[PDB]
């Protein structure tokens, strides 16, 4: 059975041996095609480093797909990967780290998929948390981070259709592409009355917003902030500006560890290829280079996508969405406690939210 190349790129310290030994279910590849995985390490996650690394891989060997993990809080990595994936029409899976932080509005030509919940699902989960504890009065704060419209609209759409007494008091939009030497964001935040506040932004943006929120007295008791996975990010990295009592939805390697994920990544790309070779007696030829993609345009396609999003493996449904998120992620609701450590306080699985406490804890 013919071999397809799969690059697994690991940024930052990670057990390559625990990873290689987990993929010993390589004697569990039964298809029309076998994976030929090659672990690459990478030290830097700027655009040039990431682009030239993947593009040297693609020219030195014959890559069919890429599995990307990193150890950072850098959501821009998703964005860079999606750009590369769309330009070169190579499949890329962001399975861990910044690479897996929600990217909204992926290119039409994108073959880039992410391990994690959609923006709309985290918003719905955030409303389920509020319904449980009867926190019906709330406000939203977002930046211009891509997705913020999808977030605000998912909220709005949900609570308009509801026999529940929601009251969305205020929606703020914070421009952090400009400096804050005019105390503009402070004067916006000063308008928040609600006891619940949903915040949609990046981790670096939350750092600043919380610092300002604190200085106008919006972090203490009587104010609860709920943020999405990418703000919590790496949970072993907690900015001092994060308030205690911060709630977050999360997918950060709790019960679904890296070696497992690289396994499922290699599985998704291999299954996919097999399904297409099965059914068209060909799969797309890996691009010889990315410096010649203006020429070979008419010869390339995102055909492999239909199959990448419909893989079942080892009795789990690893399907993706058209938008490029995982369909059925197991999520964990975490709570930043008095000792500045993130603490599990709820699980979300199968449309059901099962929280730990009935009366909400006090920090």
């Amino acid at each position: 059975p013919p071999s397809i190349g799969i690059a697994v790129i690991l940024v930052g310290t990670s057990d390559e041996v625990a990873i290689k030994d987990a993929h010993e279910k390589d004697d569990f590849h039964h298809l029309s095609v076998v994976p030929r995985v090659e672990l690459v390490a990478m030290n830097e996650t700027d655009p040039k480093s990431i682009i030239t690394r993947i593009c040297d891989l693609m020219s030195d060997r014959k890559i069919q797909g890429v599995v990307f993990a990193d150890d950072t809080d850098q959501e821009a990595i998703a964005q860079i990967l999606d750009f590369i994936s769309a330009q070169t029409l190579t499949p890329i899976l962001g399975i861990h780290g910044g690479s897996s932080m929600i990217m909204a509005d992926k290119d039409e030509s994108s073959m880039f998929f992410q391990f994690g919940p959609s923006i709309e699902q985290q918003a719905s989960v955030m409303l389920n948390i509020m319904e449980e504890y009867d926190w019906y009065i709330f406000s939203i704060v977002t930046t211009y981070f891509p997705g913020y419209q999808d977030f605000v609209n998912k909220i709005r759409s949900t609570i308009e259709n509801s026999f529940v007494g929601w009251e969305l008091e205020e929606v703020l939009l914070l421009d952090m592409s400009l400096d804050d030497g005019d105390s503009k964001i402070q004067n916006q935040l000063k308008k928040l009355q609600s006891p619940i506040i949903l915040l949609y932004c990046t981790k670096e943006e939350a750092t600043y917003i919380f610092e300002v929120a604190n200085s106008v007295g919006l972090t203490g008791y009587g104010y609860t902030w709920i943020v999405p996975s990418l703000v919590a990010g790496d949970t072993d990295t907690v900015p001092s500006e994060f308030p205690t009592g911060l709630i977050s939805v999360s997918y950060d390697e709790w019960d679904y560890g890296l070696p497992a994920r690289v396994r499922d990544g290699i599985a998704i790309i291999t299954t996919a290829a097999s399904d297409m070779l099965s059914e068209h007696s060909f799969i797309p030829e890996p691009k010889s280079s990315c410096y010649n993609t203006h020429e070979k345009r008419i010869y390339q396609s995102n055909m492999l996508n239909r199959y990448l999003i419909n893989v079942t493996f080892e009795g789990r449904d690893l399907s993706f969405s058209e938008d490029g998120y995982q369909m059925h992620p197991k999520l964990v609701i975490i709570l930043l406690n008095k000792e500045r450590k993130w603490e599990r306080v709820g699980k979300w699985k199968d449309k059901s939210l099962q929280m730990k406490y009935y009366v909400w804890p006090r920090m």
Partner: protein, 358 residues
Amino acid sequence: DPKIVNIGAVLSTKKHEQIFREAVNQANKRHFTRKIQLQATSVTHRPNAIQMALSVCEDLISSQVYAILVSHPPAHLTPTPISYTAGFYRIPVIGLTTRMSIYSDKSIHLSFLRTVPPYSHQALVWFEMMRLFNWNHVILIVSDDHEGRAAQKKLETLLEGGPKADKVLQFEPGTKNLTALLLEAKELEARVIILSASEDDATAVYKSAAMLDMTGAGYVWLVGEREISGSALRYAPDGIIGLQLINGKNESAHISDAVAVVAQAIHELFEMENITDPPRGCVGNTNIWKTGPLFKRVLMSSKYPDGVTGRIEFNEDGDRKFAQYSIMNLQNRKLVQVGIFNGSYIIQNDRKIIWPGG
């Protein structure tokens, strides 16, 4: 020894590279440059978008550019990969000739100003024409893509700020038989029709309209620049009114003005305290330029009144304000100028408008 501050540019030819170099030399001559002094660093577009992103890193950001001028090239290559990479670091990009409305979206283009307006801003001229010629009831036909909906959002804003849009009709870009759409517009009383479409989609509309006899007397067609360019002109009804952005395509002029604005902004920047340098190169740097967002604020607030292309200000989206348009009228199959929009005001010239029919 003064402090050297690099300006960057991705431009279309080597002739325009030399124009950029020379504009910066003049900025240094014109300004007091004992403290800071500009240095021009420049490059032409690369054949594809990855090569271009890399060139920004290797050629431009490696020289610690405070800003990057970008033109629309010759004859599939957009500013986009330069806005992407520069925006990673919050280095401001100044579009010189790009006019798609998508570059007004902050989520997509963090640090992007341009010295030409987006196509959607033509609605500002339409609206002043509607007050001038007392068209109080209009039908709006736009393509169901970003640019089309951008024009609708913009005109409807001006109308719900009077004259009214009796109905808005959208069609799927690419469609060739628009008889269904245009029959819907034919049944309404209003005989003033505004169009936003690409070159090839406007061609489709013009043909179908002609079959349904909607280009004759009684009917008025009011249109933008794309809808009377190249192919669109081949089948355009006589009497149609369209626009051309004056100097819209003079890359030399916009280089000259962009450099004047940017130089002014740089000297204004270094009046303030705690200005940091941009990152030297891409490799190993993942933090934004700390002073990037301040420099953007300064640029956005910049006013250059004595500009080759007229009066340089930017609105809240970083788009050019006070652009000037030729008001064009297709007469015996020739595009004839019947007026200009001078930035705020319509000025009819002595050449008489001939409407559809007349």
